[model samples]
Target chain A: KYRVRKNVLHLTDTEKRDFVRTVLILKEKGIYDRYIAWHGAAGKFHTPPGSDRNAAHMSSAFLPWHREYLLRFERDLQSINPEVTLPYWEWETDAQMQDPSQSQIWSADFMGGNGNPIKDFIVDTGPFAAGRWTTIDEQGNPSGGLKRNFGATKEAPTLPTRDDVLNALKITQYDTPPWDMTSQNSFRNQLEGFINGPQLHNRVHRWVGGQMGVVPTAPNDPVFFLHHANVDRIWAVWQIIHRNQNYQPMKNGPFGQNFRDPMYPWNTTPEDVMNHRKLGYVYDIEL
Target chain B: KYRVRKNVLHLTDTEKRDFVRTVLILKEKGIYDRYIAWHGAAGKFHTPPGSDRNAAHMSSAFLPWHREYLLRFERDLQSINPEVTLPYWEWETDAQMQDPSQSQIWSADFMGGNGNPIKDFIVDTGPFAAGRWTTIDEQGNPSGGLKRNFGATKEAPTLPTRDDVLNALKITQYDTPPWDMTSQNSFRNQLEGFINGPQLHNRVHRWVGGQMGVVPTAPNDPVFFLHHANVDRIWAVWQIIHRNQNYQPMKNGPFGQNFRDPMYPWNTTPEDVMNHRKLGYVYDIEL
Candidate 1:
């Protein structure tokens, strides 16, 4: 139960190299393809029933759900290596507009940039499924990145405008009554709108391995790690406070099932999502 | 402009006397009732309308709201005598069933050995509320204290059985899904349930300021100051975080004019609440 771990920004040259190499190796082994395959197949090994054509880049349940899911992966990683811990990537530090090298997306071009990634809005929106609301892929897959009609270049493009980001989602009106704030609907709406918006979705595929790779070299895309880290941290926080039974419970609605629910990537089983606390870890949400 | 104020709690006998006397005098002049009528009537109070009737006793919104409201009253007292500051009541130090004669609520007939005020419940709820819900005549409108429902009447009439307080609320599959937590509605439901639930609501009111006028006299009732203190602290925390605007403009439902948009107490305006900082005071939330 360590309280803290080294974040991506604090990684040493050796750690960075090891992480990058692992991602590239994983990609070569078709890990990314396998990972994304789970979504389209609905977690089946060979072929799942879900159409890859219909997808939501960022699921409403994406953040929390994946956060817990990621911890399961983290546990497997730690079992392989004792000293290793999940590292956080601070995307804000790399969000500097002019420097594409600061981006966290692991891609061929990203690694090409003096070994330092830059911020890429296209990639950010990709996984989060920003833009016109659709959650499928070109080959009819359940992709986590957005798949809109525009920006199908599958190559690095120009960064998106601030308007492109904010305009992708509608978040002006608060869903919950502002009086006494008895309703947190405003927060929910903001988050839902953010993920379903266009900014992040429009550019997800353009990144090197973002299209399909367990660990893409584009992991350096500052957004990749930061987004995933936040996802992990959010789940960690929620786990500490909520009971495990709720995580995998078998239900629907507000007080629905725990991680045990039957929701896969979009509706995965909760049984697969248990054991975050047992993994011997915690995360930093203060950031 | 000042970032912080050095507020030390002054609880000497002379200071306590002065503080209570000032509040008593203000009450006699119809100050409190007027404010309650106006604020309560206009629905210009925190904690949505029609939630807690005697919220001052049960909600954290009590202390900070009144402390600020009482500023003018205290200033008037100071004008009468320049050397005075608001004095705090330290009830935790003297927890024994106090002699009313040793305190203010004690009069002639409010004799010693008044039956313990604690309630007895066949089942448990949470805290003392699950025992037996009762408010003495002292704090009641027509009759408040001394003659009936003495100040020191906070007796643990009977401890709640394990089946009473703990399992009662759990009967309803209480709790929300982790992934669905991104929804503000999920958070809102939980908050309201905690506030309005039977778990601790009864205990909250049982101890705060019932039979005793102005301030409670039972030092050792255990619920005395901390209960009201927390209520006050919550309001202070809310104010501290929500002072940027008079009303919440975040994306969500509109509060509308039916209730105070600025989330005020009855007719009180943001201007009235703003000066809490300028009043040379702050709440010791942790304390």
Candidate 2:
């Protein structure tokens, strides 16, 4: 409850500086790579080997796994600068701009700007531009240069609108049977953006392009966390309004997707992190 | 201090049954796949992108990395059956048998018998027989079956000898400069079986063959843990004798190989697991 995660727009210039600076320090110390690999490892960890339900994506474990990931990441930030908290990229608001690429979050001092066509989509304008920031592939090889191509795809030409965010929260069920991309009327599935995919969360990933546009390699871009923070806030809001609607598959779901089952690569169960407030933090809007 | 990791030979008939039973439960619950993926991911996580030194192997972190892996896995076992502890595969002792495939540890009641030629080296007689136990590949796809071909390779036609284990303990330094497979007179490399090429721990993997012979797929064989437990026990013995020796490269080593570096896919550093007793386990010989 103490660490108030704010909207990216609400963060002061000083807040942006500290957050960016700390990320660089963490990157330098080789600590930041762990997050990339942790998320990457989970993406390929098919729940039953051949299924589409991965430990992190396409499964009921998605919400809580990323929630646990963000929680652990926030603590790492706190370790460096106690006052710094992860801020959400409220692309819904950025979506209102005539040129969303010019949004404050993409400034040279922050997460950097879109990829340059001249440099073959390698980011060249921000702190994380090709030279300043390094990137590793899904296998941990130096893939060379951070890249971003903003809304280059016809499928996801625009950001997920504020209405889409509200639409996801309107759903009562956390998830449904099949518990995968095919899940029906699932709040988890909708926010994950699979039903009409490249819609909400998946849409944002596609819109951002570069490493963010790919699964497993998405976390290579620093903005991946900011993007997920927005998704997390949407879930937190849904949890509050549907106070009685608990996580599904308290039993019967695939092993890792169950409420009490341990998420792969770590022992934390979804139930352990289900209550956001109990996890020691809340979004700034809550206050 | 309380949990006693016994040699596989010392385990009574009931202990073997409970150990095998607990593993099947963990596998059934889908908890066991995490260990396979965790170790696999670390194998590909090069400490410096393309270098031979990975997060788990070919470097100074080899011993502690696997030590931490075993510690995490043992706790998972305890979570299932408190009476079960990981037992070391004392391959050196089994090496005394002319036909080591007849070792009691490979009995149908335990790890099961060796792979059959007609079955294309698929293990068809153990608790983890081909159809009975599902195995996932490096990419999380369904790999057909568990396989083994003990000492089938000309490279590793025998298990590492007892003298090899003791010789590693006599080295005064835990690890040396370069801190990789090439580091001569270094206990870490010597025991890792890379100096003279595939001798100790590496030889065991090659001797077991099939999935055990591969880098990323080794953990698919449950005996991989038993093999590593013996490695950990040897490291523990080295620590006891070389009371003054400490983990090398506390500062300038590759990112993940440093003494205090967070082993990839985990927060627990080498320093965190440097003490075996402090990790709440000891070899029966210690008692």
Candidate 3:
């Protein structure tokens, strides 16, 4: 109710600059790399060790896992600057553009433009361009620089449109039996963008390319938070529309996916972060 | 203190078995891996990114950081079974043995003999033998089995003797100027074992060989907690012996190494965990 997460495009140039500056400070403080490692650790940790689902993805706990993750990240940002909230990328709206790369989100002042082919797809344009920002690979070793090749995949050449998001909200079930990517008619599967394979959240990751395109190294790019924040916003909107529906696998499911079971790499559970408002923040569209 | 951490040599057959049971249960439930990853992340996270001092070692915060780490781990263990507490492997006493490898601590009933040369130094005699207990590499990927070539390195052929530990406690100031491995007459530097290359803590890590020899991958071996528990106990004794001496760099030092600064990968500060009994635990010797 207090902290409103605005869309990236809605932020003023000053707001954008402040957000970037604070994040750089966090990086300089060595706090930012911990977030990267936390995300990477959660991804590698399969929920039951042998399952297809992990603590953060390919399952019912995905939403709440990232919900907790972003919540921690937002609090860390707040520790540095109280006024800055995590802004969502609103990639669906950007899909309407002639060339989505032309959006202000990719301006030199904010996130950089697409990767340069001459530099082997290393990002060369904005705040996180190759020389300016350092990156680590999945192994947690310094990988030299950040990279981005927006819409580089033939499969995800376009971002998920606005209607695609609105359509996902129509589904009533939060998730279904056998809670994984293959679960049919599951809201989690749809929003996670694995129903038809790489549709919404997953598609956006694909569209961003480079560090954002993979799970373990996705957070190396700052845009990963913006993308996840928008996905979280979509989930928030769905929660509002269907007030009665609840998270699935309340019991008799994989350990980490259960309602009260502690999520991997953290003690926070799906039940702990069930309400977005209770977490003390809301998407700008909510107001 | 209500909770008493015992030396591994003194643990009853049943107590040792029960402790192992609870740890295996935590591992089975996927909780143990998080501890490993957390330690790894902190090791890679240098206090100022480029500095040799890390969140866990080679600095003033090493003692306090591991104190807090052991506390959280003990809490996790207690959550499983309140009777269980982290046990210390007093390697100094074992060093007196003509063949330390034949000590009870390495019996098949306990931590197992050691790395078998034929199996590429993999531990095959213990409960955590290859195939039963899984291990992860520094990259967070599964590395087939638990490896342990005890005292494999010629440089660390013998464990740090009891005299080595007693001499470390003789240093009065908790740490000195420049607060790092190079600080002469500094208890932190001596105990951390960087003054004369590898002497005490560093020698013990190297003597244990295999996973214990490395910083980032050490916690993968269950004995990591035992080893750290011993180090913590040594620090605890020094705190008691040097009652008037306080942690140095209370004012000017690196950010994370400061007395009140938050440790990397965790918010717990040295001041917060400065008193072990206040955290609700004590060593058997203290009792």
Candidate 4:
């Protein structure tokens, strides 16, 4: 269970092959469909007209919730091939380059390039293009291809830099009361990119556009895992620095979900996942 | 010293004329520059790295601080023309329309239409376009023309609806501790849009794009006042419904600013700002 998560950019060709093969197996087993259903229940589509229980995206639970969600996916992937581990795509490598579009991540062998201009922004090239990987829509129906319009617009060209990460790490607190997207000097909000802070995870999704821009179906893209793994790693680094301080609202209230509150479908809570090593995985990147 | 702010969409043609004229005076007299300078000093740009003293944004001070800011602008506008008052856009009306671009607000007489295809997203038809007004950049130097790319991109077209505002109002608490963009169920974060809440203000800027999309220079656009006035009015309305409750963190912490702390340049505190009636303005809309 103690597997090390490596950077996708640094993985060997054989490792990449194993990773891709494991993902294909998950797809074959309809694991992706199961994810879509769970996401819907987690309030991805904002069902029940604003139900609070699983509306994880905009709440304090965004971090721990996603952490638990990814762990399950990791567990599923491990079930197929025990050696397979999720690798994070360190986006800053590409962002720091003059032309981010030229990054190896978008090669035809990988997640692929921008979608075809004529085909409603559907990916036409790459492994996940039309006919290769059909995405699951909100209702669990098989929708068409993965979509992306990389560096398509003006703002898309601007990506989060290393400075942004350092700035985010500088945030001292886990979260304060009413912990959500608006928490100040919060590592969570900074990583979430809500406060105009580091402009991390959210901006990457917007920059990718197409399906990635949409909330519910974003995870349908295989690239979503790599991106979120990086986000999770960043949180891990923040936790290591602020190890003594507890994430707020350890008590229950309107916005506070205590550390022991059961995250649905998973026995863990925010407190449990604070230590990645205990979860049997650690990242290569250090703070 | 007090002025009644009306919604811009509801204002008569004469009132609109007076309002526009007063803004032009403020622009000509370098009043806009004065505000921008203060905003910079208030650490709005996230400069000097990790400075919280004047870092008014993405903090608990965001609501009260901006309330004080708009009040000053309102006072300045009133000094130029007693009949003039800031107007609220209530963007939902246009968002609900089949074509938001066709709204009167986009006409040459008002804020103007989408940016020109080749003009760096500058509004070509409006009075604020390329030649009409030269904006002041961050260093107090003359920047280029006012810019907007309304409805230009796919993601740019969608705006928050009336239901969003209603949902924001439903939140009970004014704010919880660590009051920033991450405050969940806090009326402040809901209104501020960090909590997957109403998302009123930030969405407007993103929808407008160009100058408005940039944080420091957003206020350079004239519509920034109307947009923030509506945000201010929403906070005022929330106060009316939650009259018994107090804004939170009324204590001290890295992210906490007391209700009695003096907001720079204005000599007023959050407590002073809690009552807009005393500050000399009231909204036309009833909560």
lDDT of 4 by residue, B1-287 (tens): 25667777777777777777788887665455455544544443221123333335666677888888888888789889878878888787678988787877676777778888787777778767788877755533567788887754454467778888888888888877556666677877667666652266767777888767766677778888788888888888888888898867686633225676545433467888888888877887752
Candidate 2's C-alpha runs over 4 A off are none
TM-score of each: 0.30, 0.97, 0.92, 0.48
Q: Which ranges in model 1 have alpha carbons more than 4 Å from their true place? A: A2-5, A28-32, A42-60, A79-81, A103-189, A192-196, A199-226, A234-251, A254-259, A265-278, A284-287, B1-287
Docking quality (DockQ) for each candidate: 0.01, 0.79, 0.34, 0.01
Better of 2 and 3 by lDDT: 2
Compared with the true structure, what per-residue lDDT tens digits does model 3 show for residues A176-242? 9898888878888999999887899999999889988988899999999999999899999898899
> What does candidate 4 score on TM?
0.48
The lDDT for every candidate, in the order shown, is 0.33, 0.90, 0.88, 0.70
Model 2: CAPRI class: medium
Off by over 4 Å in 3: A50-52, A116-124, A130-132, A139-143, B130-132, B139-144, B176-183, B251-255
What's the true lDDT of residue B241 in model 1?
52
The alpha-carbon lDDT assigned to residue B225 of candidate 2 equals: 94
Docking category of candidate 4: incorrect
Best by lDDT: 2
Q: Ten consecutive residues with minimal summed lDDT in candidate 2 chain A?
A: A25-34
Candidate 1 on B149-237: residue-level lDDT in tens? Answer: 32332432221222332333233222122211121222122222242332232323333333322222231122233333333333344
- Model 4: runs farther than 4 Å from truth? A44-54, A153-156, A265-267, B1-287
For each candidate, give the interface RMSD after superposing the true interface residues on Cα.
Answer: 29.1, 1.3, 3.2, 24.5
Q: What lDDT does candidate 3 reach at residue B182?
A: 90
